[PDB]
Amino acid sequence: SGFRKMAFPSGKVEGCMVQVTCGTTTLNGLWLDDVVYCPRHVICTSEDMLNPNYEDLLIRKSNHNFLVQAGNVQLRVIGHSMQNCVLKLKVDTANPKTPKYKFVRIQPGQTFSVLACYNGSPSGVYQCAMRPNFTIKGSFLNGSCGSVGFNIDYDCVSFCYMHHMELPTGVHAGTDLEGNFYGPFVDRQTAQAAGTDTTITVNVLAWLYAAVINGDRWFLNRFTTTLNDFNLVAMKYNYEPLTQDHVDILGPLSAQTGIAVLDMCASLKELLQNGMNGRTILGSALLEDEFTPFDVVRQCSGVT
Amino acid sequence: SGFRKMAFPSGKVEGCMVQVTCGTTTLNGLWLDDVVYCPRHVICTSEDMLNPNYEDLLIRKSNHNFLVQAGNVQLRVIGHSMQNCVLKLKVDTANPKTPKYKFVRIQPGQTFSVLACYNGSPSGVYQCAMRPNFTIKGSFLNGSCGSVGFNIDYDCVSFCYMHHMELPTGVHAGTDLEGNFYGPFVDRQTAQAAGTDTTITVNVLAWLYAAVINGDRWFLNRFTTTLNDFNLVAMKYNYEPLTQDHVDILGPLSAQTGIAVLDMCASLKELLQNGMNGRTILGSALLEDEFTPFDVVRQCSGVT
Numbered sequence: 001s002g003f004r005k006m007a008f009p010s011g012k013v014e015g016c017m018v019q020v021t022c023g024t025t026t027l028n029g030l031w032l033d034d035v036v037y038c039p040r041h042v043i044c045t046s047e048d049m050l051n052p053n054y055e056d057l058l059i060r061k062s063n064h065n066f067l068v069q070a071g072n073v074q075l076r077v078i079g080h081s082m083q084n085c086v087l088k089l090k091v092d093t094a095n096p097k098t099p100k101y102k103f104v105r106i107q108p109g110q111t112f113s114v115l116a117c118y119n120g121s122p123s124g125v126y127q128c129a130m131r132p133n134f135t136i137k138g139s140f141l142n143g144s145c146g147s148v149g150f151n152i153d154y155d156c157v158s159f160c161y162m163h164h165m166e167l168p169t170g171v172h173a174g175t176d177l178e179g180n181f182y183g184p185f186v187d188r189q190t191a192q193a194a195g196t197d198t199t200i201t202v203n204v205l206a207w208l209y210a211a212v213i214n215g216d217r218w219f220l221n222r223f224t225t226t227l228n229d230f231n232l233v234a235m236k237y238n239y240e241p242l243t244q245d246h247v248d249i250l251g252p253l254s255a256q257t258g259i260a261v262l263d264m265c266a267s268l269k270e271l272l273q274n275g276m277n278g279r280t281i282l283g284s285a286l287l288e289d290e291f292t293p294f295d296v297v298r299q300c301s302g303v304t
Numbered sequence: 305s306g307f308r309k310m311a312f313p314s315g316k317v318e319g320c321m322v323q324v325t326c327g328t329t330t331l332n333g334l335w336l337d338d339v340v341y342c343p344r345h346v347i348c349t350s351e352d353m354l355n356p357n358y359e360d361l362l363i364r365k366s367n368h369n370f371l372v373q374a375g376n377v378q379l380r381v382i383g384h385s386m387q388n389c390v391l392k393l394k395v396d397t398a399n400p401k402t403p404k405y406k407f408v409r410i411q412p413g414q415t416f417s418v419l420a421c422y423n424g425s426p427s428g429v430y431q432c433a434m435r436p437n438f439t440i441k442g443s444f445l446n447g448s449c450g451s452v453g454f455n456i457d458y459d460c461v462s463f464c465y466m467h468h469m470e471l472p473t474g475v476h477a478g479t480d481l482e483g484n485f486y487g488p489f490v491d492r493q494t495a496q497a498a499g500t501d502t503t504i505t506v507n508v509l510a511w512l513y514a515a516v517i518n519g520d521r522w523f524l525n526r527f528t529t530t531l532n533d534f535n536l537v538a539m540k541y542n543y544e545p546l547t548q549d550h551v552d553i554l555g556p557l558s559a560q561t562g563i564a565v566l567d568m569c570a571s572l573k574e575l576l577q578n579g580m581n582g583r584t585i586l587g588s589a590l591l592e593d594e595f596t597p598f599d600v601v602r603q604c605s606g607v608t
């Protein structure tokens with residue numbers, strides 16, 4: 001029993017983190033097979049960052065300009081290419097600790113673990129969601145760029161995120177491992193405002209199920225609703241719309257608890273309209289939206 | 305910028321987790337050097353758990369009765385002893401992945417990372433505090449016993465917790481790595497009630513400093529207080545007393561933010577008396593007490 005914001009064990013990713021230096025810029029790289037992936041802005045002076053032309057900046061760079069260090073041993077760079085907003089540095093040594101891995105582009109509402117790194121050295125691990133505005137609310141100081149987000153399926157690491165940017169509002173933007181930004185963000189020190197950070201409705205419902213499973217039941221009401229009625233209320237409160245795909249996904253939690261999804265929707269509706277009245281659910285005074293239904297099932301079942 | 309509940313990278317501890325089986329009971333063990341540490345209740349039938357005599361139960365056990373598996377390879381047990389509420393199983397192989405380590409007994413309010421394990425396999429990592437009532441609020445299913453809590457100082461893992469028990473209220477109890485329970489709990493399926501789960505005042509203050517550092521300043525008031533005045537209010541709200549040792553410990557956060565500790569106390573006092581009025585601090589609707597001052601400095605500075 002008990003329910004925690006839980007990251008994947010980070011060991012498999014710890015074994016992939018290296019330091020990348022280009023001139024005076026140091027950040028982190030991900031070493032898989034004989035390729036090191038890092039944010040292309042490693043080649044910029046903070047001066048360059050205001051309106052960088054990366055193709056033109058890259059012409060001035062050689063393999064020997066990229067200094068790649070794995071522990072306290074240097075890797076030999078034998079090639080470099082730009083793919084979207086990441087650099088791929090070919091090194092002469094396959095990472096001996098390369099895990100089984102995939103590159104995946106996640107959808108808004110999907111959760112993942114971040115291994116926060118500085119100078120290629122892991123500092124911490126936390127759980128995130130891709131926000132509906134394609135930002136994440138991370139913890140990232142200078143030097144944390146190239147830190148990655150991942151899910152693990154038994155022994156296969158799915159890399160979904162590389163850290164590139166902090167927006168002027170102190171939220172975070174980055175790319176998948178093909179170098180494509182989540183949302184409309186660009187690796188340039190310019191005015192970039194995020195859209196509405198809506199609540200991930202399907203995730204709140206999952207977490208309400210987690211609460212029932214763990215004995216927190218005070219919020220369970222006598223009402224039901226319809227998708228359309230619930231969705232009217234969701235919009236008013238800056239909650240993402242709930243689809244039938246979300247209802248289907250919650251099916252196993254519905255089954256385990258014997259609470260129909262639309263009943264749990266009507267409980268959520270009353271919590272939106274009435275608030276928590278100073279009460280807590282799973283030790284939170286607000287509705288948590290950074291657990292997926294899959295996360296709740298994993299943690300409530302005990303997958304390794 | 306940004307502030308997350310952050311666990312230590314778990315790789316060094318992942319490399320120490322094994323499966324321990326005695327008869328039909330499977331749980332986790334910690335393999336350091338040529339010793340495997342596990343909860344002594346591995347020797348009990350759930351029937352034994354009602355009033356176990358562990359010395360008498362252990363007489364009926366041999367080295368060959370303890371099945372220790374590290375990945376899918378069996379370790380040979382060449383000795384076993386009981387130290388308090390843990391078993392130490394001497395195996396014929398030193399763990400090749402043993403990190404530098406210490407055993408430390410933490411104080412209430414101290415935070416640590418838990419690597420939740422099932423059948424010797426890591427499932428997740430989260431950050432905890434030892435509660436003032438010597439419980440922890442974990443996430444632990446059947447088979448999670450022998451999962452450990454740790455801090456890391458660069459390359460040295462300090463093991464502070466091994467998981468043994470869930471109380472009938474679904475909070476968690478366990479031992480240090482010398483087998484001594486935190487608080488008054490015993491490894492017996494009997495009536496064990498926790499005392500008052502008070503809020504860790506010094507930790508809330510640290511987190512209020514973290515909030516100021518990260519731009520959340522709305523709660524900063526025009527008042528100050530004294531330790532004695534603040535402490536009267538703390539007691540009324542089930543907050544731990546604040547000592548001069550706590551004020552001294554917050555000194556560096558006081559310095560960084562230019563907010564005197566007693567000023568931040570007076571801000572906390574107003575939040576206790578007035579509540580949050582539907583506002584959030586670092587995305588929480590309640591006051592977080594599971595960051596130490598050391599945690600706030602680490603995450604705000606970027607230690608690896």
Ligand SMILES: Oc1ccccc1CNc1nc2ccccc2[nH]1
Nearest residue numbers: 132196198234235237238239240241
């Ligand atoms: O639903 C809302 C409630 C309040 C504010 C903003 C929104 C828009 N949310 C939204 N989710 C989407 C998913 C796919 C495509 C477009 C989407 N727009």
Ligand SMILES: Oc1ccccc1CNc1nc2ccccc2[nH]1
Nearest residue numbers: 436500502538539541542543544545
């Ligand atoms: O302060 C309180 C406010 C409300 C309820 C309970 C308490 C007691 N808290 C407490 N912390 C201690 C630390 C060391 C020794 C004894 C201690 N008692």
